[PDB]
Design an enzyme around this catalytic site. Structure first.
Site, short mmCIF file in Angstrom:
data_model
loop_
_atom_site.label_atom_id
_atom_site.label_comp_id
_atom_site.label_asym_id
_atom_site.label_seq_id
_atom_site.Cartn_x
_atom_site.Cartn_y
_atom_site.Cartn_z
N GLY A 1 107.43 -10.17 -21.05
CA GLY A 1 107.59 -9.95 -19.62
C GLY A 1 106.80 -8.74 -19.15
N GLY B 1 105.59 -7.60 -15.13
CA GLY B 1 106.51 -7.10 -14.12
C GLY B 1 106.33 -5.65 -13.71
CD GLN B 2 109.63 -1.53 -10.35
OE1 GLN B 2 109.68 -0.48 -9.71
NE2 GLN B 2 110.71 -2.26 -10.60
CG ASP C 1 105.02 -12.14 -17.75
OD1 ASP C 1 105.36 -13.18 -17.15
OD2 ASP C 1 105.52 -11.02 -17.48
CB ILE C 2 105.90 -17.26 -18.09
CG1 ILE C 2 106.63 -16.44 -17.02
CG2 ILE C 2 106.78 -17.52 -19.30
CD1 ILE C 2 107.79 -17.18 -16.37
CE1 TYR D 1 118.87 -8.19 -14.88
CE2 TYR D 1 120.32 -6.79 -13.58
CZ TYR D 1 119.21 -6.94 -14.39
OH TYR D 1 118.42 -5.86 -14.69
N1 NAD Z 1 113.03 -2.52 -12.47
C1 NAD Z 1 114.25 -2.06 -12.61
O1 NAD Z 1 114.74 -1.21 -11.65
C2 NAD Z 1 115.15 -2.40 -13.76
C3 NAD Z 1 116.46 -1.86 -13.85
C4 NAD Z 1 117.30 -2.18 -14.92
C5 NAD Z 1 116.84 -3.05 -15.92
N2 NAD Z 1 115.56 -3.59 -15.83
C6 NAD Z 1 115.09 -4.54 -16.89
O2 NAD Z 1 113.73 -4.34 -17.22
C7 NAD Z 1 113.12 -5.60 -17.56
C8 NAD Z 1 111.93 -5.89 -16.65
O3 NAD Z 1 112.14 -5.32 -15.40
P1 NAD Z 1 111.06 -5.45 -14.23
O4 NAD Z 1 111.58 -4.67 -13.09
O5 NAD Z 1 109.70 -5.18 -14.72
O6 NAD Z 1 111.21 -6.99 -13.78
P2 NAD Z 1 110.15 -7.87 -12.95
O7 NAD Z 1 110.94 -8.87 -12.11
O8 NAD Z 1 109.21 -7.01 -12.23
O9 NAD Z 1 109.32 -8.60 -14.11
C9 NAD Z 1 109.95 -9.55 -14.94
C10 NAD Z 1 108.88 -10.30 -15.75
O10 NAD Z 1 109.61 -11.30 -16.45
C11 NAD Z 1 108.72 -12.39 -16.52
N3 NAD Z 1 109.42 -13.59 -17.06
C12 NAD Z 1 110.34 -14.38 -16.42
N4 NAD Z 1 110.72 -15.36 -17.25
C13 NAD Z 1 110.06 -15.23 -18.42
C14 NAD Z 1 110.06 -15.94 -19.62
N5 NAD Z 1 110.81 -17.02 -19.77
N6 NAD Z 1 109.23 -15.52 -20.67
C15 NAD Z 1 108.43 -14.39 -20.52
N7 NAD Z 1 108.42 -13.68 -19.33
C16 NAD Z 1 109.23 -14.09 -18.31
C17 NAD Z 1 108.16 -12.50 -15.13
O11 NAD Z 1 107.06 -13.38 -15.00
C18 NAD Z 1 107.88 -11.03 -14.84
O12 NAD Z 1 106.53 -10.62 -15.09
C19 NAD Z 1 114.21 -6.65 -17.41
O13 NAD Z 1 114.77 -6.97 -18.68
C20 NAD Z 1 115.19 -6.00 -16.47
O14 NAD Z 1 116.47 -6.55 -16.49
C21 NAD Z 1 114.70 -3.28 -14.77
#
Ligand code: NAD
Ligand code: NAD
Lengths: 311, 308
Positions: free
Chosen positions: A6, A9-10, A32-33, A137
């Site tokens: 993944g 993502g952010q 990532d996907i 979630y």
């Molecule tokens: N950003 C935050 O404030 C925050 C806070 C707490 C926890 N987290 C955790 O950090 C991790 C990522 O956070 P983020 O903010 O970058 O999320 P995001 O939504 O920005 O990115 C998530 C990524 O997951 C990918 N994804 C979805 N399904 C997938 C799959 N089946 N196989 C591979 N990739 C897949 C998406 O394409 C995306 O690029 C997560 O596990 C999230 O729960 C983030």
């Protein structure tokens, strides 16, 4: 060799180059996907809900560590809980079992304040507390922490996890979470526009700036094994604020901008979470520390968002 | 129309006739992956890990309520965690999704003290407490309680659950479960044979007799959904005792009874659970009550096991 799932993502967008600079572009594999430019760093398409794909990637690249970021966040999860369950629950199980079956030394999982619920104390909540999440979630995430701990106690697999609060950043834009407003507000502020906030004006939540979030995840990854008592579920935070407070502070820099509150389903999610966290365990067990206080991240965000928007 | 999954287990063997007795024989359907005698009540083979099977059954028999008993318990879960995850996690998810899709108005899930961990207080534990299970079984079960409450708050699916302590019974044969020593011990006592207990002599755990376990499950099922606030995770118990305590009490009736302790992995499982539970919430919300104290359970077990 480090594999990041993944990574588009952010967090992943910044974690990949962060890991690359520390360990070498050659020792990091982004996946990532959805593919995005990873500036020279190897990228592979990997759907975590497909056990076969994980096996193949871990085997081909002799993966030693996995930063498992892939997942459906709080808000997006409520729009499609079935998707969140498949990706978060089955996906995390797949990663754990794949790591265990192969020669993967460590797995690091970013959990969340989403594991908490209405019964969880609101102020300075410790890591061991009531965990009755009310979002799909949240249920998949507390499950991930428990599964992680079980894989260590049962199979000896080194799995570690921390709980991130809302993460603020400027490089990659958040779109599926509940704390997204903390980033969105800056865009409106710099453009001197009226921001429509979806959380209640007094909705207090724990937050932290990306630089510290990255440092924390890597510090946990590198932590000495002999001090890792909690191991999974480490509360991590930098500060707590409400939307009206962030608005006011930004206003101190940019007076010609405003806000209005039109709460939606995300405010209902936020209402079930604690306002502030106690991160003492993380600091005591692996040296967790914060370098960016609220003032510093506000000014750094204004600086970078202003350049990004050509202001 | 009530559907019962995992009907051939320790609980199912008794719950089915219990249900037919109260709601009518033509309104209960038994199901499991292993068939046993249901005394006339309809029985169908149903693998809960196969979502498609659940859909066909619910559809074909116009299922209105489900008592989801199917699963792998604590001890067997540690021997085969992958199986426990598959049938417990994926199986319960399948049941919930199928229930949500179709017109199921009630689903009852028997949770367990297995959702607790070392951090959970050992005495008079209330339902809202620390739940950091250390067994695969426990992980799948706390997830089940959470998914349940979620489906209710999200889709309105009437899912309810309670946390059973160790269950003592004579109808079904024990299956080497973590708390099954409380059943095996009676087989050996009635034969005046020395019992080899796998839990420590002073390993205290909450327990309850089958008749009360069945009454509790149905009382929770019959509660008016408006009266339930906790809804999922109801602590339930009748008493707390240790193996040496049960042995001592049994010996008061069968003096030639002998026992030795050879603790194994099941004792390590038990050590992570609380000793006693506070069941106020169950009693205040749906009138949970016990009719068989420890003495009556002991005397009743001895009577039945002797008969066989
Ligand atoms: N950003 C935050 O404030 C925050 C806070 C707490 C926890 N987290 C955790 O950090 C991790 C990522 O956070 P983020 O903010 O970058 O999320 P995001 O939504 O920005 O990115 C998530 C990524 O997951 C990918 N994804 C979805 N399904 C997938 C799959 N089946 N196989 C591979 N990739 C897949 C998406 O394409 C995306 O690029 C997560 O596990 C999230 O729960 C983030
Ligand atoms: N017996 C107890 O002391 C106790 C305590 C707490 C909770 N519980 C819960 O009560 C329920 C049943 O308990 P029990 O003691 O009767 O268990 P049991 O082991 O006696 O019976 C479980 C049944 O599940 C069946 N099963 C396994 N996989 C299946 C599948 N894929 N599809 C359909 N059936 C399947 C087995 O064949 C068996 O008949 C479980 O959910 C268990 O976790 C029991």
């Amino acid at each position: 060799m480090i594999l990041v799932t993944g990574s588009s993502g952010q967090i992943g967008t910044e974690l990949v180059p962060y890991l690359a600079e520390k360990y070498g572009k050659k020792n990091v594999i982004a996946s990532d996907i959805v593919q995005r430019d990873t500036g020279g760093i190897k990228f592979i398409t990997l759907d975590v809900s497909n056990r076969d794909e994980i096996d193949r990637a871990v085997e081909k690249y002799s993966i030693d560590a996995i930063f498992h970021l892939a997942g459906i966040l709080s808000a997006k999860g409520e729009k499609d809980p079935a998707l969140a369950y498949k990706v978060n629950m089955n996906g995390t199980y797949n990663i754990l079992e794949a790591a265990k079956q192969h020669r993967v030394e460590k797995v690091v999982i970013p959990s969340t304040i989403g594991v908490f619920g209405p019964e969880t104390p609101k102020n300075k909540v410790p890591s061991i507390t009531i965990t009755r999440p009310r979002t799909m979630y949240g249920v998949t995430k507390i499950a991930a922490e428990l599964l992680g701990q079980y894989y260590y106690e049962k199979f000896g697999l080194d799995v570690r996890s921390l709980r991130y609060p809302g993460i603020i950043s400027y490089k990659a834009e958040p779109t599926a979470g509940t704390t997204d407003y903390a980033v969105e507000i800056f865009y409106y502020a710099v453009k001197r526009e009226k921001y429509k906030c979806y959380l209640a004006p007094n909705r207090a939540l724990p937050m932290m700036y990306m630089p510290d979030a990255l440092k924390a995840l890597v510090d946990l990854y590198e932590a000495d094994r002999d001090k890792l008592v909690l191991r999974n579920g480490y509360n991590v935070t930098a500060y707590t604020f409400t939307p009206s407070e962030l608005y006011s502070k930004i206003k101190e820099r940019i007076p010609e901008f405003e806000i209005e509150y039109k709460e939606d389903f995300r405010d209902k999610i936020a209402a079930t979470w604690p306002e502030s966290l106690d991160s003492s365990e993380a600091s005591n067990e692996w040296g967790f520390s914060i370098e960016y206080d609220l003032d510093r991240t506000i000014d750094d965000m204004i600086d970078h968002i202003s350049e990004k928007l050509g202001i």
